[PDB]
């Protein structure tokens, strides 16, 4: 399921100037836009080739949406402090996350409009796109405002209509990159730990998208409790990396098999040292 997400972060810096507003946009695991209020001339900048062919009008329009929301989130951070009865003195974080998941029918599958204040859920739009979930007493104040202003109407219309049409457009403009999965390049390394044990490390490199399953089995028995499994990490070039390591008795390496599952693989892999 393809998706488009926006990630906004507004951070107050008492005594260190205006709150910083940073925003990034993604199509799946591919970032396509940034905006940093601390930049020389803050603007919406393309981060993917499939959006740099949209006109100067598009970019001036995105730039304006960002510039205005950066000023708005500055108001929001003061409002929130007030709600929670917090001092002028402390640094606070306001985060927004919104977007759409595309369905098989070419229509919306799921719409998102979530927020967090100081890393905790603040207020979210429900899956029905007609109501809100206020996580506490403060968020209930916002919700009173939004129910009167009838804010869900605007959002339902964006997530069902506008969001889906842009994702479909962006997915077409970058179909050669966004709709082609890249299978992981896999291999096993061996690193002795003592004269009687060795680490077997299963590698998965240069894969896109990030979703992957790396497991080690000993005689077909899942070694989930004995596997060191690092978090999926960016290679820095738009592809991802992951590894699963297991400490095996020396001479017993052939009893171990690594299993790889990825969208880009026609069948799951089984690797042996």
């Amino acid at each position: 399921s393809h998706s488009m997400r926006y990630f906004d972060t507004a951070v107050s810096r008492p005594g260190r100037g205006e709150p910083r507003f940073i925003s990034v946009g993604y199509v799946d695991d591919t970032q396509f836009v940034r905006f940093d209020s601390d930049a020389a001339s803050p603007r919406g900048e393309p981060r993917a080739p499939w959006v740099e062919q949209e006109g100067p009008e598009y970019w001036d329009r995105e730039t304006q949406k960002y510039k205005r929301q950066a000023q708005a989130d500055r108001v929001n951070l003061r409002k929130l402090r007030g709600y929670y009865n917090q001092s002028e003195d402390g640094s606070h974080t306001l985060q927004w996350m919104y977007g759409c998941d595309l369905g098989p029918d070419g229509r919306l599958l799921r719409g998102y409009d979530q927020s967090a204040y100081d890393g905790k859920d603040y207020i979210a739009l429900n899956e029905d796109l007609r109501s809100w979930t206020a996580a506490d007493t403060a968020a209930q104040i916002t919700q009173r405002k939004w129910e009167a202003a009838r804010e869900a109407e605007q959002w339902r219309a964006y997530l069902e209509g506008t969001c889906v049409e842009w994702l479909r457009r962006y997915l077409e403009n970058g179909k050669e990159t966004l709709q082609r999965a890249e299978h992981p390049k896999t291999h096993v390394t061996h690193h002795p730990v003592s004269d009687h044990e060795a680490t077997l490390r299963c590698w998965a490199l240069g894969f896109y998208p990030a979703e992957i399953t790396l497991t080690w089995q000993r005689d077909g028995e899942d070694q989930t409790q004995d596997t060191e499994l690092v978090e999926t990490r960016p290679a820095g070039d738009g592809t991802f990396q992951k590894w699963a390591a297991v400490v095996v008795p020396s001479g017993e390496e052939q009893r171990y098999t690594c299993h790889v599952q990825h969208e880009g693989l026609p069948e799951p892999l089984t690797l042996r040292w």
Binding site: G25, E62, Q69, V75, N76, T162
Partner: peptide
């Protein structure tokens, strides 16, 4: 492309 309006808490 971003939501066309501003959100105030």
């Amino acid at each position: 492309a971003r939501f066309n309006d501003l959100r105030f808490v």
